[PDB]
């Protein structure tokens, strides 16, 4: 074994002591778990979405998943850079995630999207707290990275909010 | 002051006398004002569109705005090339525009789109008259430029017409 | 006249005797006729689609048509490579096609899509039989090409199936 | 039936009344039919061309077909934009076409090319009349679009004319 | 009316309550108004710039305008994301702007540039205050977005400062 | 619930009855589970790899993960296309996977790589059986897709085999 | 054994643990793949030869076609060679070995007119085409679907070029006695 | 005064009217930025040195990494220098000035083995990394959010490369005594 | 006048005295005149080429002309860099050219090509002498530039030689 | 036969007499033979390289082979341009090559690389002599081309030299 | 130490003995020192340039610096390839440079540019001598590389010469 899960050694290269590093790592690993479950659920909805606006949603969800996957990669690599061990196995990621995950059945798109929006909100609030924690610790690179990811997550969260809004070009007439 | 608003000196480089130039400039500046209000309203709807088909409309409207902005740039620069002064300030553009502009409230997408379609029609009819005026004046470059813009405007006007058509994949069943 | 419609001479370059070649050509030409009518009907729906989700469908249908056109080109060229004569004129293509083609009236998008889905299924089933026929004849290049096209056709057929599914973001409320 | 073949309703979006629109639509649909038969014959020659200069002709014809297909798409969409119904089925396109189409046999390249050149000329002369008709009707976007297509068609028609010219690098000696 | 100008509902998706959201929205809308007047004035100078270094300035100003337009789009969309209504009409934008706008006459380039530099400074100082306001409110995505825009605006403001500096390659001799 | 996990309805669009479809779906879902655990373990090694050749391995592993992720997407979408429900949650994927997954500790690169190579072999052997199963069922598109993925997986499996081979440029002297 | 200099001996096939391919099955594919490799590389070199030497009224188009044909042949050879290596075998490498192991006929060092040159190449393609068809079946039968798939992917590109040459040699032309 | 030849004197900071930054506040950022610039440019030159000289079993990958690291360091320096200039200051320019003003240690002109070379560079990164963190706070405190943001943008790229070097120096390898 | 035709002042920037510079300039201007007549004749043949292989020749000649135009630009700019005055007007270029130019009639392609090949040979031999003259003068940049152009010119000269060779795919049979 | 191996006719197009041409051709053909054996051996090592740094070497060797293949193409075409016959068959190339070629067994990477480095040195020294021979003959295009290739060959030769140097990041500890 | 500054071992790979190699290395290292001081001074002027034409000069100087940096990289790597040690530290580079470097004050653009032009001339003359030295030593790759760099340096040197010429579009009137 080269490293033990749960341990945080910090980094000499990045001049980050283990105490300070572990504070960021704990926050980052928690985010990582949630972001990866989000990724998998976005993939699920991407694969299963059907209906009148399925292709646009399919494409949106695919892009949302890609973004979530990139954020997770950033998070995981920052955890590793800070001398920590990023959650890796699917089982570990879900167990460590605090957000709710749909069961294996497929729900209609409005329900599916609403579930995803709930996951985003949770991650969004957490990321805001984590960027402050990082800035407070003087880890400006982590803080900056978190904000860079936060803006992409909020964009997708906002997109879902608009998909669920009570407007449409459809009329009873065209119906 | 280098040039006075309302004045048209023509161009020696383009061999266009002030009399003939002013005829085109008057037409071009009128179009410019309408095209820029269109641009701003398309931006408005682009920003605010919500609902089941919001992302596709968001993207369409963004592209429509970009097109409107490019047409305005063409118009403004042609006015300047002909020795005239293109309407510049937001206040001047709206005051000089003849099309109707929504008030600051946000309306549902069908209403919003319908308002935009009305603006396009006005600009479309005007541009047709202006291309003839230009050809008649022997200003073939202006005439050509107007047609180049006309085709892009009509494409977007047509798109909105189709968005508002009484058809949909939606059924009472899926509802 | 350089070649007579209906004749299959095989190919010395491809070491394919006329007997074996004609078996593939008969299958390929039948597919070609159906694929080209599909192409034209997809173009029709691409041009005419209107409504709340018309732009996304317009784009999808345009891409579906392009794919159908490329498959036909592949089919036609393989027929020619095997010493045969690919169906060419519009009249010949339709007459040789076994799938149903809408009359010249324009139907609502759900009806239009459903008609196209029926054409895909027919072509899909036929292509599956033709790839086996080709493999059995030892014409692995034709077999491979058919599968390459089959996967693109099935993707579009699947897309239409999802467009017609009983789900939507629309609610009676937004309506 | 959402729309009936032969009917032209004009467009409110494009401020084009049905009377004026129908004049353009009749012209556009006639061109569409001819352009699509041209497309299919160009495809035929593209597939079948053989001989000393076949690869260059194969590529040229492929490009000529793509151009013809884009012109047809433009024509068809303009017809639809003007409230009309573009000819769609292969059978309808050929029946509505006024140009001559080769029978299903394959002819030598000089004969093939000559037949295509005849189709181009017909379309070229018609398009010139149609652009005037459109300008006269004040439909400058249609007029402009026709000229844009006319220039591409004339380029390919000219190419064929040069391919058939009485010159060559070949000498009796190299023969 | 789907939304009323001046109202801010916050966002459930982004877990941003209306109280906090309105604080950011008020700041963002003020910036939007100023950024859009800047955009229009930059366009004005872009169109009208003449003289020995006009082409380089024309290109610079065009790029400055594009940047201002993208910043405005960011601002407007963030306002919308936070449940607010972004200023849209030209008239509203100018009325809501606090920066000074040139009258419709065209001034020499040094005067024009100096006026623009004054607009930038105002926006720059405001954006700095607004990023702090956002960070204080814990809206790190807005804060980050503001800084991203601030750096681009300061770059262009700096460019103008250098264009106006008292140095040149010109000598009395070359004169 | 729009669809229940474990159910397979086949597809009318793809002319695939539920009986035949379920046979492919069972195979595809099993592969999906294994491919996604592979993806996550490849990501793990990508993040954690250290040492003399870490950067090249980091890049290789990143690419291997991306490939595994695309294969999973293909598999999942084919399952969905065939009327089935692709395993989605991290917990479900791992539970349904038959390959071994490392515990959360980080091992040296040779051990890590060896574990991954074992996962590839399992997936490789399974995919070979599944392509035959698909061809036998006459589902040539699934068969083809499996082979397309098989070749990419075997390439990466082979890469790992070479990374572990007993050769190196290193000498006791340079040591 | 532990002391041979060679890391691998030409002719040996060890299969692959990574690809779960035993030496017995692997050697069957390797024998087929190496034979194809030899022929494909001689084809590559002859296509290069004709690419370099083609002259006349339609030389530039042929020059470009032949260059592309050579590139394709080179890529197919690379695929074949790497698959051989992946299956635990040793791909024919030296020019001398490639030609010796090739079964197709190669022109002598003189330069022939383009019709003759092209005809010779078409003969090489046919040989490779027929062999590749047999080899894809052999691979599918052995359950080596990745090799089978790769062979078909290459087969389609080779047949396209073989077909092109066939058309270049067809009895048609825009030339007339008049233009002559 | 009106007659000095120099357009600007090294060490002076006039702030900026365009950026609404007074000289007092500007000079605080400029002092920080110029110090970073000096260190970043010596880093750049040492990374170039190692890029040029790296040899051995993994030299090509290191050559490419070091080249990219140098490019990144050069871009950061350009950003720093231009921000200094934007704030009315004079960025250190000459090679002699840059090194003299740098606080990090620079290798002498001899070439050392890659592990030693890399270790020296890692030490330079840490120094710059710690300094940049302090400087971003200084800038935020001064309300110069554009400088603060720019510093973080550069900090993340520098930390990435510092981290890469750390991994290159880690005690792991695919090499075994057997392959040796 | 800013500079007088025929005068060569050398360059202080390039440390090239007028004496040495004038030797290169005389050589470069002679080449420039010939290269530009070549350019214009290549354009002529590009425009006029007809026959069985016209399209390939049209494209080749177009590329040959572009190459000749770039070489002339290089030559002219080097002349200017060395303090000289490059021949500019069409009349001056032809008068200063030593190669033969066809009269205004259009000749068959073999004759046209043969004339061009003669021009290339002349330029090729001259360029070889000029590169030696430059190297001897120690003007290695001019020498290098000449060789860079020489290789492109020889490539095109060689192409024409091959177009004129006594070989063809054509047979009396296909004839 | 159109041309006999061993004969050199020079070129009228390139103004190169057979006497002078044959001197360059003899040099070029010798280089061609060596460069192509190098190409094939680089391919061999590219295919077979295994071990801790195999992927980087695999990629390097692939690129080295591509470079060698391009140099051979240049050489062969220059030989043909000068009226000669480039060595073509694999058998001829190896027989005409003076460098040593490994037997068909696969050696460890250090041995393989060392063998390649020996081939490069031979080609490098020869190319230096050949560029002088060409310059002396006044064939500056051949001379220039040789140097262009020489620089790429020396770069790869140098790369191999560095791969074989006595340094590594590996330590007895990591071992 | 792995290598000692000042030592030149030549290269076995490149068949370059230490004696001959050291002659090139001494020349190359001298050029490297000058080119890097040039690079840094070009950067200085790039950063500091202000005034009426600053943006164009800013861009030019940036490009000039990039070019100087690439030339230095080439030089340094060639030194290393020949078994030498390229000057590395800023202090060493300046100490080893023979060109004059401005003190740390910022001068007006004309003065700055004139200083740079002086540096170019020095490097230009030196590079000419060094290419001859290399050719004489039979090191054609170094010779070729030097000329490739010489042409880019002379282009920039020439650009500065033109920036300083006594011409301008400015008139006393516009002033
Ligand atoms: Fe990553
Ligand atoms: Fe503009
Ligand atoms: Fe085709
Ligand atoms: Fe279309
Ligand atoms: Fe146009
Ligand atoms: Fe937007
Ligand atoms: Fe950023
Ligand atoms: Fe997907
Ligand atoms: Fe494929
Ligand atoms: Fe390869
Ligand atoms: Fe810069
Ligand atoms: Fe130029
Ligand atoms: Fe070059
Ligand atoms: Fe070639
Ligand atoms: Fe480098
Ligand atoms: Mg670590
Ligand atoms: Mg003007
Ligand atoms: Mg045929
Ligand atoms: Mg309609
Ligand atoms: Mg909203
Ligand atoms: Mg300044
Ligand atoms: Mg479904
Ligand atoms: Mg192996
Ligand atoms: Mg001059
Ligand atoms: Mg020849
Ligand atoms: Mg060395
Ligand atoms: Na909808
Ligand atoms: Na011909
Ligand atoms: Na290693």
Swiss-Prot record, chains A, B, C, D, E, F, I, J, K:
Protein's UniProt name: DNA protection during starvation protein
Give the EC number.
1.16.-.-
Q: Which GO terms describe its cellular component?
A: cytoplasm
Site description Involved in iron translocation, residues in chain = 47, 50, 79-80, 158, 162, 165
Native source organism of the sequence? Halobacterium salinarum (strain ATCC 700922 / JCM 11081 / NRC-1)
Protein family according to the UniProt entry:
Belongs to the Dps family.
Q: Which UniProt keywords apply?
A: Cytoplasm, Iron, Iron storage, Metal-binding, Oxidoreductase
**What does this protein do, in the record's words?**
Protects DNA from oxidative damage by sequestering intracellular Fe(2+) ion and storing it in the form of Fe(3+) oxyhydroxide mineral. One hydrogen peroxide oxidizes two Fe(2+) ions, which prevents hydroxyl radical production by the Fenton reaction.
* Other information: The dps dodecamer comprises iron-binding sites for iron translocation, oxidation and nucleation. Fe(2+) atoms are initially bound to the outer surface in proximity to the iron entry pore from which they are translocated toward the inter-subunit ferroxidase centers via two discrete steps. Iron oxidation proceeds by transient formation of tri-iron ferroxidase centers and Fe(3+) atoms move to two distinct iron nucleation centers where iron mineralization occurs.
Give the site residues for Involved in iron nucleation.
69, 148
The record lists Fe cation 2 as bound by 77
Catalysed reactions listed for this entry? 2 Fe(2+) + H2O2 + 2 H(+) = 2 Fe(3+) + 2 H2O
Q: Where in the cell is it found?
A: Cytoplasm
Can you summarize the PTM annotation of this record? The N-terminus is blocked.
One biological process term from GO is: intracellular iron ion homeostasis
GO MF term set? ferric iron binding; oxidoreductase activity
Q: Which Pfam families match?
A: Ferritin (PF00210)
Annotated positions binding Fe cation 1: 46, 73, 77
UniProt xrefs under Gene3D superfamilies? 1.20.1260.10
Complexes and interactors: Homododecamer. The 12 subunits form a hollow sphere into which the mineral iron core of up to 110 Fe(3+) can be deposited.
């Amino acid at each position: 074994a080269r490293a033990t899960a749960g341990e945080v050694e910090g980094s000499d290269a990045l001049r980050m002591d283990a105490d300070r590093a572990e504070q960021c790592v704990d926050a980052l690993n928690a985010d990582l778990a949630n972001v990866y479950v989000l990724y998998h659920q976005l993939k699920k909805h991407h694969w299963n979405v059907e209906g009148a606006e399925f292709r646009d949603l399919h494409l949106f969800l695919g892009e949302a998943a890609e973004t979530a996957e990139e954020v997770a990669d950033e998070l995981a690599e920052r955890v590793q850079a800070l001398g920590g061990v990023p959650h890796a196995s699917p089982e570990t990621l879900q167990a460590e995630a605090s957000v709710d995950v749909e069961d294996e059945d497929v729900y209609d798109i409005r329900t599916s999207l609403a579930n995803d929006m709930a996951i985003y909100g949770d991650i969004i609030e957490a990321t805001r707290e984590h960027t402050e924690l990082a800035e407070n610790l003087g880890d400006h690179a982590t803080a900056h990275m978190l904000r860079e990811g936060l803006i992409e997550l909020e964009d997708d969260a906002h997109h879902i909010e608009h998909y669920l809004e009570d407007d449409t070009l459809v009329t009873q007439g065209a119906l």
